Design a protein around this ligand. Sequence first.
Ligand SMILES: *[C@@H]1O[C@H](CO)[C@@H](O[C@@H]2O[C@H](CO)[C@@H](O[C@@H]3O[C@H](CO[C@H]4O[C@H](CO[C@H]5O[C@H](CO)[C@@H](O)[C@H](O)[C@@H]5O)[C@@H](O)[C@H](O[C@H]5O[C@H](CO)[C@@H](O)[C@H](O)[C@@H]5O[C@H]5O[C@H](CO)[C@@H](O)[C@H](O)[C@@H]5O)[C@@H]4O)[C@@H](O)[C@H](O[C@H]4O[C@H](CO)[C@@H](O)[C@H](O)[C@@H]4O[C@H]4O[C@H](CO)[C@@H](O)[C@H](O)[C@@H]4O)[C@@H]3O)[C@H](O)[C@H]2NC(C)=O)[C@H](O)[C@H]1NC(C)=O
Ligand SMILES: CS(=O)(=O)c1cc(Cl)cc(COC(=O)N2CC[C@@H]3CN(C(=O)c4ccc5[nH]nnc5c4)C[C@@H]3CC2)c1
Ligand SMILES: [Ca+2]
Ligand SMILES: [Cl-]
Ligand SMILES: [Cl-]
Ligand SMILES: [Cl-]
Ligand code: NA
Ligand SMILES: [Zn+2]
Length: 803
Amino acid sequence: ATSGSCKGRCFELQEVGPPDCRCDNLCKSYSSCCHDFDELCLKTARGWECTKDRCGEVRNEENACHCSEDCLSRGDCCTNYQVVCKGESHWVDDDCEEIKVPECPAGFVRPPLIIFSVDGFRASYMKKGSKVMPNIEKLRSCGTHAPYMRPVYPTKTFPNLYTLATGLYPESHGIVGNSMYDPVFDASFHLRGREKFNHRWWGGQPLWITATKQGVRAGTFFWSVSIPHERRILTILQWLSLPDNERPSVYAFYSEQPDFSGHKYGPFGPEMTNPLREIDKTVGQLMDGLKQLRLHRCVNVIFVGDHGMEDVTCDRTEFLSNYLTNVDDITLVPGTLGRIRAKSINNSKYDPKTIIAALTCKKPDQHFKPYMKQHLPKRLHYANNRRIEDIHLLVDRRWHVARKPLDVYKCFFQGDHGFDNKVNSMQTVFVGYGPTFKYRTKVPPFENIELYNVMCDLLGLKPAPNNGTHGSLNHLLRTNTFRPTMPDEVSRPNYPGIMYLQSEFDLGCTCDDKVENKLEELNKRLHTKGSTKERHLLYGRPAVLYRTSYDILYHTDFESGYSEIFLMPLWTSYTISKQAEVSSIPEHLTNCVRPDVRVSPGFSQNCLAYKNDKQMSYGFLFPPYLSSSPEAKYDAFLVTNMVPMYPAFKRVWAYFQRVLVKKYASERNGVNVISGPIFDYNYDGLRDTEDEIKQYVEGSSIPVPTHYYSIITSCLDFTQPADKCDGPLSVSSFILPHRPDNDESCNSSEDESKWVEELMKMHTARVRDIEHLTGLDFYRKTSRSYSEILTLKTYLHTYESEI
Ligand SMILES: *[C@@H]1O[C@H](CO)[C@@H](O[C@@H]2O[C@H](CO)[C@@H](O[C@@H]3O[C@H](CO[C@H]4O[C@H](CO[C@H]5O[C@H](CO)[C@@H](O)[C@H](O)[C@@H]5O)[C@@H](O)[C@H](O[C@H]5O[C@H](CO)[C@@H](O)[C@H](O)[C@@H]5O[C@H]5O[C@H](CO)[C@@H](O)[C@H](O)[C@@H]5O)[C@@H]4O)[C@@H](O)[C@H](O[C@H]4O[C@H](CO)[C@@H](O)[C@H](O)[C@@H]4O[C@H]4O[C@H](CO)[C@@H](O)[C@H](O)[C@@H]4O)[C@@H]3O)[C@H](O)[C@H]2NC(C)=O)[C@H](O)[C@H]1NC(C)=O
Ligand SMILES: CS(=O)(=O)c1cc(Cl)cc(COC(=O)N2CC[C@@H]3CN(C(=O)c4ccc5[nH]nnc5c4)C[C@@H]3CC2)c1
Ligand SMILES: [Ca+2]
Ligand SMILES: [Cl-]
Ligand SMILES: [Cl-]
Ligand SMILES: [Cl-]
Ligand code: NA
Ligand SMILES: [Zn+2]
């Protein structure tokens, strides 16, 4: 019954549900507005700007906004009122003055936060559109900015907007696409329709709920498309004029541009200048408005995008009907990513192995690649949700994927987004301006999952649990609310000595090692006691953050943390100087594996299991090829340095170890390497407990890793060697999937120099990702501040060309 009125209720802040009619900014979307809503709340008379004649006018309540003398008190002047009528200046015209402290009106308990979000605002617009965006350029250069901010995958609207609000990966918050099907709900989420309004889709805890639960009032974050931007600004300005006990502390403004035009004209279509002009004018209105309310040196403003925009056209579409004979037995979620599932959910005939095989490397210039979702690069964090189909297609930038030619022809678009989140055109923007942000400061690029913690900080809230790393963006803020602290080590290591005789071992292992002093025997003794450890463990031992039993093992060339539960190192650490030399495994040592006299037969692997497992071979965490001497090389063949490896994977690993490590050491002036196994059988991005392992080397208790990681650190100033670095560090990491084939790599039949490094780059990772997956904590002992270390751990080396 939409029988009531909006008289004196325009844009009320507490949503009253039907039968009674609504007057809030979402009533339109719910089709529940009072009949006078447009009349009372959506006035448009005389436009949005004051004119010289309108100055000092007599108040007419039918105007969109007012230029009467009483307007400042009422809180509803046109944003340009003071400029036109009182000889004031526009906010953009004033010089940039540092905001050393909040300058707020009496009654303001804390600086308000305004989140100005812009849809499809590609990172490079800041430079390429600078001439036409003066208000935005002022915010950017006077406040705190990043060259770009990295969105989450898929680089879609809803997943990214909701990630900004929650600090969660789409897989955790549930909005895994702009459209999705949930097999338990048996329902589809679409941009059009009512399904999207049901609360069951939306997980996690968004900023507005966090604020509310802790006594902080929020304006609405959603705006009906039919409410013009001018009216959105005026409403926020009106809300900011409310009494102390009624006024929100956090606000949000949303713009459908430049996304809307970008899809039609491409990211840099000549038609794109005008929407950039218009976003800027809107920002100018907001800032003029705040300057009227004397809040422009009081409010913190975030100008943030959800994702970028890429050139994409109808002709650049791959069709599945070109690869698959049985295209009618599948459903495809199409576009800039592909998700495939059975047409009929309960049929045993559907074999996803054969679907993938048919999609794998079939055309030489194929513009997508199929994955089982658990095999996608771990950095995408796109697997742990039932709404994510088992089959995924990663589509090349500039391209689309569709099921059949008919879906596409029965071409109106030149731009789209959704691709891999490391892709340059998908990068978006961040600017922070206000008393709490830093003054004229550029910060390095960061991921959007980190922003939720900052917004909570800006508002004095305790953030719900999320995927940000709290403290990693403290360097954006003039004054911090949160002091990060290293987590306490849970398990302390054992430091075992020589306790077992060779003959106590029945491993089925052999080696040609029976050939051999005062000088060289007391010296190798120091190596096993930790003498070269200051060289090979450069940032302290990683802390183990869960309950387990493990040994620190020292050697001349490397140090490891050996798990007696998993029968292999959790981590192996070693430094390769720029002058280090690669050698080969001597002919008589090719099948050499030696018992480790510090570790019991009971907590060791055996060579017999590997003999009997025809699928599984083994490799070594510290590489024999990088031994410092023939005597030291024997250490590399210890049974405690050994890890299970598919022969297909050994090709990757051997090339990394034999060739790439030395190359990185040359280019970066030495590198420190920490390598180890990862077990993530339920693809949740977190370390598996021992009873979750789904695969063992056949007939043994040796678990098989799902992935192998390395963290490769050196000095940021490369004129200093990795092992003698005084300043900031530089890191790149990866998490390689441990797969029994190389189907992922279409050129894998060629030499490793043509494909291995490309594969590794694809599977680049943050140290922080590896921490979740191992339960380890790295960089415990450096000369660097912990906040700078947190930033370092969230760094991702993307290998894209310069933005
Ligand atoms: C990124 O960050 C996020 C957030 O920090 C990380 O995700 C967290 O990771 C935890 C480990 O997986 C997980 O812990 C679970 O929680 C189970 C209950 O979860 C429900 O309630 C959650 C809390 O909401 C409350 O919030 C505040 C807190 O004060 C309260 O005031 C409120 O009143 C709320 O109650 C809620 O977040 C969660 O939401 C998920 O599910 C919803 C649908 O039901 C979705 O709408 C929503 O999007 C979430 O969906 C995600 O998460 C689920 C897993 O929860 C996942 O399957 C989806 O795909 C999607 O990813 C729920 O509503 C709790 O029962 C679990 O406890 C089990 O394990 C422990 C382990 O020790 C046992 O002790 C315990 O006995 C229990 O085992 C029992 O159950 C087993 C399975 O049924 C059974 O086999 C066994 O025998 C036992 O009976 C466990 O603690 C968090 O829920 C999760 N949080 C979120 C938001 O996802 C994430 O890991 C980070 N990512 C990375 C890579 O780092
Ligand atoms: C960043 S924040 O302030 O926390 C924040 C979080 C959230 Cl969840 C929503 C907000 C603010 O959202 C809102 O007002 N919404 C209302 C409009 C919706 C309808 N949309 C589309 O039809 C659409 C747009 C672009 C596309 N490209 N390709 N397909 C597309 C489809 C966009 C939606 C955004 C949400 C802000
Ligand atoms: Ca796991
Ligand atoms: Cl192979
Ligand atoms: Cl465990
Ligand atoms: Cl670019
Ligand atoms: Na074998
Ligand atoms: Zn879009």
